[PDB]
RNA sequence: AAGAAAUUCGUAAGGAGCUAUAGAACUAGUAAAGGGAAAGAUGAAAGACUAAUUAAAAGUAAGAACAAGCAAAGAUUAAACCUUGUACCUUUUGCAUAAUGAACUAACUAGAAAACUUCUAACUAAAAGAAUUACAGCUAGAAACCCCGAAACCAAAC
RNA sequence: UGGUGAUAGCUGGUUACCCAAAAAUGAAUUUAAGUUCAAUUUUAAACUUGCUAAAAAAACAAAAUCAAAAA
């Protein structure tokens, strides 16, 4: 660093010596003299994740491959930005990276492409779709604040009748999907590509990959209606029978 | 015009007084204090402009909101009339 | 805070003016500029007058000896004499004997020039007409 | 300059001064004053040579 | 009240300028004034003249009787310039006479004495010293330096110069600095001649030449209030000198003056004296 | 032009002001409702005779004028003579022998905003100290648009 | 008395220096003092021929419109 050596040779700097960078500040005109003298909401605003964008996160180790993909974890890693003021209502995927993302992992995304669904399943990944209420999703993205507010964990909402067919559809692999068709559906997709179907049971970590929360359950770890002792780093569970009726309701 | 016929007395100023010497200290409270306190929080002055800046109309409007109930009746009426002129100048010219 | 000295700048040039002009800045400033401009215009015209004065003095000196100014100049030109008009005035004033010699030289060339013109160049060039 | 012109007496007086200044005195009694405020070496050298001539 | 100290300071300078113009200060010698070093100035003075001077001798030449009295008075509560003064004045008289004789052998011995006295005149010596800053270098008890005291030093410096540089350089110095003062000076201006007609006749009889017969060469405006008369001195019927005059007497007197210049070889067209010679 | 909310979020003596035409109208609301001024200056001591300070505004005096002339310029030995020259601002048109305005002195007396862009930098598939944008973007800084003046109109007192 | 620094496409005024560049055509507008459209000017960027000139050839009838090569 020859620049540093020049500083030693140069005289000690003072407050007055400081000077603004060249061209940083423009000149101004003032009237001192003659110079200035004389004279749509209903449609969900899906926020997608590109397959190429998905690929680098796994390759860079930003998201642990062993841990199932969680949208909250992506927010924790600053992978995606969700603004409640924007009233983002959904999540999607982008066709970009279809040719550059060869990997298998369990994941849940609100909306997924049918071609993408089978391709990751062909690789061995597990993909499903869940419905998060836009207000609930904002709560999900920021779980700590409502604990600060003191609010208790509410039951996850269900899709409106317009979106019920999508989630209930077996091919869409939604949480409302019929399990009976899943073994047949998995078989059908394998034939379409022709790849040899790997049964989810064969995987050693099958239970971890296939683990899913209840439709009313917002969080994998936390059941609906739960409370968290944030100050004491503990979880509080309601013990009132009437409260169970509220959760059932 | 005409000018003074007497010279003013000489004056000496100390540039290393505590105020000048300690000017700017703790200005890095946020970065050096874990950002618990923002430097904007260190501003002391009129309530309506602590940590906030705006044009003359915005400053006047904010001033009215902050101390409107605690302002004098005569001052409030004068402020209302003054706001009208400021609003028209900026928003119509 | 220097407005007084700005007026002094106009006043110092206007100290020698007469009337309310010398004491009124409104008029003093106008007079000062007018005075300066007048000198600027005269500079170019000043040189022309000096040449006119020199030529006029030469003619009187030549006429004193009986020689016209145009005739004297032409004959000197024919002799490849390049003395300037200013020097010519000095020679007459301070070297009257030399001026007569110059007068005699010009007249002799004029006589030779008239003979040469009448001769049409057939005759040999004169001694004073030889180059 | 001093070696070149030893017939001129040169006084150099570093002192607390707002503006540096040069004073030239001539045999006939003429004295000329020139302010040296914020002038480079090259400019100063040219000015001194003019004063000497 | 206008604020600021610069404006107040500026006006104080403005007041000082007006006061100085109204009441200019009395003169003071440069020795008393600041930035004066006698030793340094003398060394520069000698180098400035491109001449070699003995520092001790030059200081003695500058030393004057009046200066010693002031120092002695202070001492009560040293070599004068008289010895050097005599040498320079005496040497200058010989050198000045020698220069005059060579150029004007015809000029009479009486005229040379007048010319020598004029060149050694107090006014001429004083003027040279002041223009050379010698007055500041002169040592005296009074400023402005009295002229007779200043005149003494100048010849004393010449005496010191003679010892330091010899007659040859001093002779060149006299020619370079003193003989130059004769430029533009007419003969009668430097030498007073009364009764030119009688003097002209006296020279002619000495040369055994007939006295010229005055004649009126030209006449103009005789009866007017502005008459012009030209009178020519005719020796053996030959004109020797002619002069213009408002009256015949004036023309004759002027013609006599012209003849005297011709007699002593002081013609307006005479060969100029030469200062270029390094020898 | 007006303009919410839902939903999030919120503990706690000084002046890069004026200094007697400036700053409150003010030394003062003093000298029908109502309107509303002007001004003062010594020194430590006046139980030291009340201070000085300034070629300092215009105005005058000391010291009126001398054929010829936008008043000056070129000059010069010389103030005037000789030579040259159709007052100024604004406005007409790039023209006035048009037309407006000026007794003079001092003070006072009119250009103010960032939506976007360029420029100057920080960090960068990320950038901004919460609310913002993004397939090189994002953040910060700098960069801008006067004064006085009607006939009128209305409310409430007298 | 206050609203009130009313409003006025109108009248008038609006304070230091230097360098550089720089022209009252077509269309419309309660528009002809302004503004939009074309044209100009102007800055940045892309990359290559441009201006004057210009024969024959037509067009006309039996040095300009056009624009080969040049210079």
Coordinates of N, CA, C and O in Angstrom, one line a residue, chain A residues 104-238:
Chain A
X104 N -32.5 -33.2 -5.0 CA -33.7 -33.8 -4.3 C -33.7 -33.3 -2.9 O -32.7 -33.4 -2.2
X105 N -34.9 -32.8 -2.5 CA -35.1 -32.4 -1.1 C -36.6 -32.3 -0.9 O -37.4 -32.0 -1.8
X106 N -37.0 -32.4 0.4 CA -38.4 -32.2 0.8 C -38.7 -30.7 0.9 O -37.9 -29.9 1.4
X107 N -39.8 -30.2 0.3 CA -40.1 -28.8 0.3 C -41.6 -28.7 0.3 O -42.4 -29.6 -0.2
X108 N -42.1 -27.5 0.7 CA -43.5 -27.1 0.6 C -43.6 -25.7 0.1 O -43.0 -24.8 0.7
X109 N -44.3 -25.5 -1.0 CA -44.5 -24.2 -1.6 C -46.0 -24.0 -1.9 O -46.6 -25.0 -2.3
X110 N -46.5 -22.8 -1.6 CA -47.9 -22.5 -1.8 C -48.4 -22.9 -3.2 O -49.4 -23.5 -3.4
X111 N -47.6 -22.6 -4.3 CA -47.9 -22.9 -5.6 C -46.6 -23.5 -6.3 O -45.5 -22.9 -6.1
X112 N -46.8 -24.6 -7.0 CA -45.7 -25.2 -7.7 C -46.1 -25.6 -9.1 O -47.3 -25.8 -9.4
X113 N -45.2 -25.7 -10.0 CA -45.4 -26.1 -11.4 C -45.5 -27.6 -11.5 O -44.8 -28.3 -10.8
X114 N -46.5 -28.0 -12.3 CA -46.7 -29.5 -12.4 C -45.4 -30.2 -13.0 O -45.0 -31.2 -12.5
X115 N -44.8 -29.5 -14.0 CA -43.5 -30.1 -14.5 C -42.4 -30.1 -13.4 O -41.7 -31.0 -13.3
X116 N -42.3 -29.0 -12.7 CA -41.4 -28.9 -11.6 C -41.6 -29.9 -10.5 O -40.7 -30.5 -10.0
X117 N -42.9 -30.1 -10.2 CA -43.3 -31.1 -9.1 C -42.7 -32.5 -9.4 O -42.1 -33.1 -8.6
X118 N -43.0 -33.0 -10.6 CA -42.5 -34.3 -11.0 C -41.0 -34.4 -11.1 O -40.4 -35.4 -10.7
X119 N -40.4 -33.3 -11.6 CA -38.9 -33.3 -11.8 C -38.2 -33.5 -10.5 O -37.2 -34.3 -10.4
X120 N -38.6 -32.7 -9.5 CA -37.9 -32.9 -8.2 C -38.3 -34.2 -7.6 O -37.5 -34.9 -6.9
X121 N -39.5 -34.7 -7.8 CA -39.9 -36.0 -7.3 C -39.1 -37.1 -8.1 O -38.7 -38.1 -7.5
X122 N -38.8 -36.9 -9.4 CA -38.0 -37.7 -10.1 C -36.6 -37.8 -9.5 O -36.0 -38.9 -9.3
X123 N -36.1 -36.6 -9.1 CA -34.8 -36.6 -8.3 C -34.9 -37.2 -6.9 O -33.9 -37.7 -6.4
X124 N -36.1 -37.3 -6.4 CA -36.4 -37.9 -5.1 C -36.9 -37.0 -4.1 O -37.1 -37.4 -2.9
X125 N -37.1 -35.7 -4.4 CA -37.7 -34.7 -3.5 C -39.2 -34.9 -3.2 O -39.9 -35.5 -4.0
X126 N -39.6 -34.4 -2.1 CA -41.0 -34.4 -1.7 C -41.5 -33.0 -1.8 O -41.0 -32.1 -1.1
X127 N -42.6 -32.8 -2.5 CA -43.2 -31.4 -2.7 C -44.7 -31.5 -2.4 O -45.4 -32.4 -2.8
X128 N -45.1 -30.5 -1.6 CA -46.5 -30.3 -1.3 C -46.9 -28.8 -1.3 O -46.0 -28.0 -1.3
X129 N -48.2 -28.5 -1.3 CA -48.6 -27.1 -1.3 C -49.5 -26.9 0.0 O -50.4 -27.7 0.2
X130 N -49.3 -25.8 0.7 CA -50.1 -25.5 1.8 C -50.6 -24.1 1.7 O -50.1 -23.2 0.9
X131 N -51.8 -23.8 2.3 CA -52.4 -22.5 2.3 C -52.1 -21.7 3.5 O -52.5 -22.1 4.6
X132 N -51.5 -20.5 3.4 CA -51.2 -19.6 4.5 C -52.0 -18.4 4.3 O -52.0 -17.7 3.2
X133 N -52.8 -18.0 5.3 CA -53.6 -16.7 5.2 C -52.6 -15.6 5.0 O -51.6 -15.5 5.7
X134 N -52.8 -14.6 4.1 CA -51.9 -13.5 4.0 C -51.5 -12.8 5.3 O -50.4 -12.5 5.5
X135 N -52.5 -12.6 6.1 CA -52.2 -12.1 7.5 C -51.4 -13.1 8.3 O -50.4 -12.7 8.9
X136 N -51.8 -14.4 8.2 CA -51.1 -15.4 8.9 C -49.7 -15.6 8.4 O -48.7 -15.8 9.2
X137 N -49.5 -15.5 7.1 CA -48.2 -15.7 6.5 C -47.2 -14.6 7.0 O -46.1 -14.8 7.3
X138 N -47.7 -13.3 7.1 CA -46.9 -12.3 7.6 C -46.6 -12.5 9.1 O -45.5 -12.3 9.5
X139 N -47.5 -13.1 9.8 CA -47.2 -13.6 11.2 C -46.2 -14.7 11.2 O -45.3 -14.7 12.0
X140 N -46.3 -15.6 10.2 CA -45.3 -16.7 10.0 C -44.0 -16.1 9.7 O -43.0 -16.6 10.3
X141 N -43.9 -15.2 8.8 CA -42.6 -14.6 8.4 C -41.9 -13.9 9.6 O -40.7 -13.9 9.7
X142 N -42.7 -13.4 10.5 CA -42.2 -12.7 11.7 C -42.9 -13.3 12.9 O -43.8 -12.8 13.5
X143 N -42.4 -14.5 13.4 CA -43.0 -15.1 14.5 C -42.7 -14.4 15.9 O -43.6 -14.4 16.7
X144 N -41.5 -13.8 16.0 CA -41.2 -13.2 17.3 C -42.1 -12.1 17.7 O -42.5 -12.0 18.8
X145 N -42.4 -11.1 16.8 CA -43.2 -10.0 17.2 C -44.5 -10.3 17.8 O -44.8 -9.6 18.8
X146 N -45.3 -11.3 17.4 CA -46.6 -11.5 18.0 C -46.4 -12.1 19.4 O -47.3 -11.9 20.2
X147 N -45.3 -12.8 19.6 CA -44.9 -13.2 21.0 C -44.7 -11.9 21.8 O -45.1 -11.9 23.0
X148 N -44.0 -10.9 21.2 CA -43.8 -9.7 21.9 C -45.1 -9.0 22.2 O -45.3 -8.4 23.2
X149 N -46.0 -9.0 21.2 CA -47.4 -8.5 21.4 C -48.1 -9.2 22.5 O -49.0 -8.7 23.1
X150 N -47.8 -10.5 22.7 CA -48.5 -11.3 23.6 C -49.6 -12.2 23.0 O -50.3 -12.9 23.7
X151 N -49.8 -12.1 21.7 CA -50.8 -12.9 21.0 C -50.5 -14.4 21.1 O -49.3 -14.7 21.0
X152 N -51.5 -15.2 21.2 CA -51.2 -16.7 21.2 C -51.3 -17.2 19.7 O -51.9 -16.6 18.8
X153 N -50.7 -18.4 19.5 CA -50.7 -19.0 18.2 C -52.1 -19.3 17.8 O -52.8 -20.1 18.5
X154 N -52.6 -18.8 16.6 CA -53.9 -19.1 16.2 C -53.9 -20.3 15.2 O -52.8 -20.7 14.7
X155 N -55.1 -20.8 14.9 CA -55.2 -21.9 13.9 C -55.0 -21.3 12.5 O -55.4 -20.2 12.2
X156 N -54.2 -22.1 11.7 CA -54.0 -21.7 10.3 C -55.3 -21.7 9.5 O -56.1 -22.6 9.7
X157 N -55.5 -20.7 8.7 CA -56.8 -20.6 8.0 C -56.8 -21.5 6.8 O -55.8 -22.2 6.4
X158 N -58.0 -21.6 6.2 CA -58.2 -22.5 5.0 C -58.5 -21.6 3.8 O -58.9 -20.5 3.9
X159 N -58.3 -22.2 2.6 CA -58.4 -21.4 1.4 C -59.9 -21.0 1.1 O -60.8 -21.7 1.6
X160 N -60.1 -19.9 0.5 CA -61.5 -19.6 0.0 C -62.0 -20.6 -1.0 O -61.2 -21.3 -1.7
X161 N -63.3 -20.7 -1.2 CA -63.9 -21.7 -2.1 C -63.3 -21.6 -3.5 O -63.3 -22.6 -4.2
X162 N -62.8 -20.5 -3.9 CA -62.2 -20.3 -5.2 C -60.9 -21.2 -5.3 O -60.7 -21.8 -6.3
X163 N -60.1 -21.2 -4.2 CA -58.8 -21.9 -4.2 C -58.9 -23.3 -3.6 O -57.9 -24.0 -3.6
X164 N -60.1 -23.7 -3.0 CA -60.2 -25.0 -2.5 C -59.9 -26.1 -3.5 O -59.2 -27.0 -3.2
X165 N -60.5 -26.0 -4.7 CA -60.2 -27.0 -5.7 C -58.7 -27.2 -6.0 O -58.3 -28.3 -6.2
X166 N -57.9 -26.1 -6.0 CA -56.5 -26.2 -6.3 C -55.8 -27.0 -5.2 O -55.1 -28.0 -5.4
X167 N -56.1 -26.7 -3.9 CA -55.4 -27.3 -2.8 C -55.9 -28.8 -2.6 O -55.2 -29.7 -2.4
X168 N -57.2 -28.9 -2.8 CA -57.8 -30.3 -2.7 C -57.4 -31.2 -3.8 O -57.6 -32.4 -3.7
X169 N -56.9 -30.6 -5.0 CA -56.6 -31.5 -6.1 C -55.4 -32.4 -5.8 O -54.4 -32.0 -5.2
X170 N -55.6 -33.7 -6.1 CA -54.5 -34.6 -5.8 C -53.2 -34.4 -6.5 O -52.1 -34.4 -6.0
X171 N -53.4 -34.1 -7.8 CA -52.2 -33.8 -8.6 C -51.4 -32.6 -8.1 O -50.2 -32.6 -8.1
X172 N -52.1 -31.6 -7.6 CA -51.4 -30.4 -7.0 C -50.7 -30.8 -5.7 O -49.9 -30.0 -5.2
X173 N -51.0 -32.0 -5.1 CA -50.3 -32.4 -3.9 C -50.5 -31.5 -2.7 O -49.6 -31.3 -1.9
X174 N -51.7 -30.9 -2.7 CA -52.0 -30.0 -1.5 C -52.3 -30.8 -0.3 O -52.5 -32.0 -0.2
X175 N -52.2 -30.0 0.9 CA -52.5 -30.6 2.1 C -54.0 -31.1 2.3 O -54.2 -32.0 3.1
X176 N -54.9 -30.6 1.5 CA -56.2 -31.0 1.4 C -56.4 -32.1 0.3 O -57.5 -32.7 0.2
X177 N -55.3 -32.5 -0.3 CA -55.4 -33.6 -1.4 C -55.8 -34.9 -0.8 O -55.5 -35.2 0.4
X178 N -56.4 -35.7 -1.6 CA -56.8 -37.1 -1.1 C -55.6 -38.0 -1.1 O -55.0 -38.2 -2.1
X179 N -55.3 -38.6 0.1 CA -54.1 -39.5 0.1 C -54.3 -40.7 -0.7 O -53.3 -41.3 -1.2
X180 N -55.5 -41.2 -0.9 CA -55.7 -42.4 -1.7 C -55.1 -42.4 -3.1 O -54.5 -43.4 -3.5
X181 N -55.2 -41.2 -3.7 CA -54.7 -41.1 -5.1 C -53.2 -40.9 -5.1 O -52.5 -41.0 -6.1
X182 N -52.6 -40.5 -4.0 CA -51.1 -40.2 -3.9 C -50.3 -41.4 -4.4 O -49.4 -41.2 -5.3
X183 N -50.4 -42.6 -3.9 CA -49.7 -43.7 -4.5 C -49.9 -43.9 -5.9 O -48.9 -44.1 -6.7
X184 N -51.2 -43.8 -6.4 CA -51.4 -43.9 -7.8 C -50.9 -42.7 -8.5 O -50.3 -42.8 -9.6
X185 N -51.1 -41.5 -8.0 CA -50.6 -40.3 -8.6 C -49.1 -40.3 -8.8 O -48.6 -40.0 -9.9
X186 N -48.4 -40.7 -7.7 CA -46.9 -40.8 -7.8 C -46.5 -41.8 -8.9 O -45.6 -41.6 -9.7
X187 N -47.3 -42.9 -9.0 CA -47.0 -43.9 -10.1 C -47.2 -43.3 -11.5 O -46.4 -43.5 -12.4
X188 N -48.3 -42.5 -11.6 CA -48.6 -42.0 -12.9 C -47.6 -41.0 -13.4 O -47.2 -41.0 -14.5
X189 N -47.1 -40.1 -12.5 CA -46.1 -39.2 -12.8 C -44.8 -39.9 -13.3 O -44.1 -39.4 -14.2
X190 N -44.4 -40.9 -12.6 CA -43.2 -41.7 -13.0 C -43.3 -42.2 -14.4 O -42.4 -42.2 -15.1
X191 N -44.5 -42.7 -14.7 CA -44.7 -43.2 -16.1 C -44.6 -42.1 -17.1 O -44.0 -42.3 -18.2
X192 N -45.1 -40.9 -16.8 CA -45.1 -39.8 -17.7 C -43.7 -39.5 -18.1 O -43.4 -39.4 -19.3
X193 N -42.8 -39.3 -17.1 CA -41.4 -39.1 -17.4 C -40.7 -40.4 -17.8 O -39.7 -40.4 -18.6
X194 N -41.2 -41.6 -17.3 CA -40.5 -42.8 -17.5 C -39.5 -43.2 -16.5 O -38.9 -44.3 -16.6
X195 N -39.2 -42.3 -15.5 CA -38.2 -42.5 -14.5 C -38.7 -43.6 -13.5 O -39.9 -43.8 -13.3
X196 N -37.8 -44.3 -12.9 CA -38.1 -45.3 -12.0 C -38.6 -44.7 -10.7 O -37.8 -43.9 -10.1
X197 N -39.8 -45.0 -10.3 CA -40.4 -44.3 -9.1 C -39.6 -44.7 -7.8 O -39.6 -45.9 -7.5
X198 N -39.0 -43.8 -7.1 CA -38.5 -44.2 -5.7 C -39.6 -44.0 -4.7 O -40.0 -42.9 -4.5
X199 N -40.0 -45.1 -4.1 CA -41.1 -45.0 -3.1 C -40.6 -44.2 -1.9 O -39.5 -44.3 -1.4
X200 N -41.5 -43.3 -1.4 CA -41.1 -42.4 -0.3 C -40.7 -43.3 0.9 O -39.8 -42.9 1.7
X201 N -41.3 -44.4 1.1 CA -41.0 -45.3 2.2 C -39.6 -45.8 2.2 O -38.9 -45.9 3.2
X202 N -39.0 -46.0 1.0 CA -37.7 -46.6 0.9 C -36.6 -45.7 1.6 O -35.7 -46.1 2.2
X203 N -36.8 -44.3 1.5 CA -35.9 -43.4 2.1 C -35.7 -43.6 3.6 O -36.7 -43.8 4.3
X204 N -34.5 -43.6 4.0 CA -34.2 -43.8 5.4 C -34.8 -42.7 6.3 O -35.4 -43.0 7.3
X205 N -34.8 -41.5 5.8 CA -35.4 -40.3 6.5 C -36.8 -40.1 6.0 O -37.3 -38.9 6.1
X206 N -37.5 -41.1 5.6 CA -38.9 -41.0 5.1 C -39.7 -40.2 6.0 O -40.5 -39.3 5.6
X207 N -39.7 -40.5 7.3 CA -40.6 -39.9 8.3 C -40.2 -38.4 8.4 O -41.2 -37.5 8.5
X208 N -39.0 -38.0 8.4 CA -38.6 -36.6 8.4 C -39.0 -35.9 7.2 O -39.6 -34.8 7.3
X209 N -38.8 -36.5 6.0 CA -39.2 -35.8 4.8 C -40.7 -35.7 4.6 O -41.2 -34.7 4.2
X210 N -41.5 -36.8 5.0 CA -42.9 -36.8 4.9 C -43.6 -36.1 6.0 O -44.8 -35.9 5.9
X211 N -42.9 -35.7 7.1 CA -43.6 -35.0 8.2 C -44.2 -33.7 7.7 O -43.6 -32.9 7.0
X212 N -45.5 -33.5 8.1 CA -46.2 -32.3 7.8 C -47.1 -31.9 8.9 O -47.5 -32.7 9.7
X213 N -47.3 -30.5 9.1 CA -48.1 -30.0 10.1 C -49.6 -30.1 9.8 O -50.0 -30.3 8.6
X214 N -50.4 -30.0 10.8 CA -51.9 -30.1 10.7 C -52.4 -28.9 9.8 O -51.8 -27.8 9.9
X215 N -53.5 -29.1 9.1 CA -54.0 -27.9 8.4 C -54.3 -26.7 9.3 O -54.0 -25.6 8.8
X216 N -54.7 -26.9 10.5 CA -54.9 -25.8 11.4 C -53.6 -25.4 12.0 O -53.5 -24.3 12.6
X217 N -52.5 -26.2 11.9 CA -51.2 -25.9 12.5 C -50.4 -25.0 11.6 O -50.1 -25.4 10.5
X218 N -50.0 -23.8 12.2 CA -49.2 -22.9 11.4 C -47.8 -23.4 11.3 O -47.1 -23.3 10.3
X219 N -47.2 -24.0 12.4 CA -45.8 -24.3 12.5 C -45.6 -25.8 12.6 O -46.3 -26.5 13.3
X220 N -44.6 -26.3 12.0 CA -44.2 -27.7 12.1 C -44.0 -28.0 13.6 O -44.5 -29.0 14.1
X221 N -43.2 -27.2 14.3 CA -42.9 -27.5 15.7 C -44.0 -27.3 16.6 O -44.2 -28.1 17.6
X222 N -44.8 -26.2 16.4 CA -45.8 -25.8 17.3 C -47.2 -26.0 16.8 O -47.5 -25.7 15.7
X223 N -48.0 -26.7 17.7 CA -49.4 -27.0 17.3 C -50.2 -25.7 17.5 O -49.8 -24.8 18.2
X224 N -51.3 -25.6 16.8 CA -52.2 -24.4 16.9 C -52.7 -24.2 18.3 O -53.0 -25.2 19.0
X225 N -52.9 -22.9 18.7 CA -53.3 -22.6 20.0 C -52.3 -22.6 21.1 O -52.6 -22.4 22.2
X226 N -51.0 -22.9 20.7 CA -49.9 -22.9 21.7 C -49.5 -21.5 22.0 O -49.8 -20.5 21.4
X227 N -48.7 -21.5 23.1 CA -48.0 -20.2 23.5 C -46.6 -20.5 23.8 O -46.2 -21.7 24.1
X228 N -45.7 -19.5 23.7 CA -44.3 -19.6 23.9 C -43.8 -18.7 25.0 O -44.2 -17.5 25.0
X229 N -43.1 -19.2 26.0 CA -42.4 -18.5 27.0 C -41.1 -17.9 26.5 O -40.0 -18.5 26.7
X230 N -41.2 -16.9 25.7 CA -40.0 -16.4 25.0 C -39.0 -15.9 26.0 O -37.8 -16.2 25.8
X231 N -39.4 -15.2 27.1 CA -38.4 -14.8 28.1 C -37.7 -15.9 28.7 O -36.5 -15.9 28.9
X232 N -38.4 -17.0 29.0 CA -37.8 -18.2 29.7 C -37.4 -19.2 28.7 O -36.9 -20.3 29.1
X233 N -37.5 -19.0 27.4 CA -37.0 -19.9 26.4 C -37.8 -21.3 26.5 O -37.2 -22.3 26.5
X234 N -39.1 -21.2 26.8 CA -39.9 -22.4 27.0 C -41.2 -22.2 26.2 O -41.6 -21.1 25.8
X235 N -41.9 -23.3 26.0 CA -43.2 -23.3 25.3 C -44.3 -23.6 26.3 O -44.2 -24.5 27.1
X236 N -45.4 -22.8 26.2 CA -46.5 -23.0 27.1 C -47.7 -23.5 26.3 O -48.1 -23.0 25.3
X237 N -48.3 -24.6 26.9 CA -49.5 -25.2 26.2 C -50.7 -25.0 27.0 O -50.7 -25.2 28.2
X238 N -51.8 -24.5 26.4 CA -53.1 -24.3 27.2 C -53.5 -25.6 27.8 O -53.5 -26.7 27.2

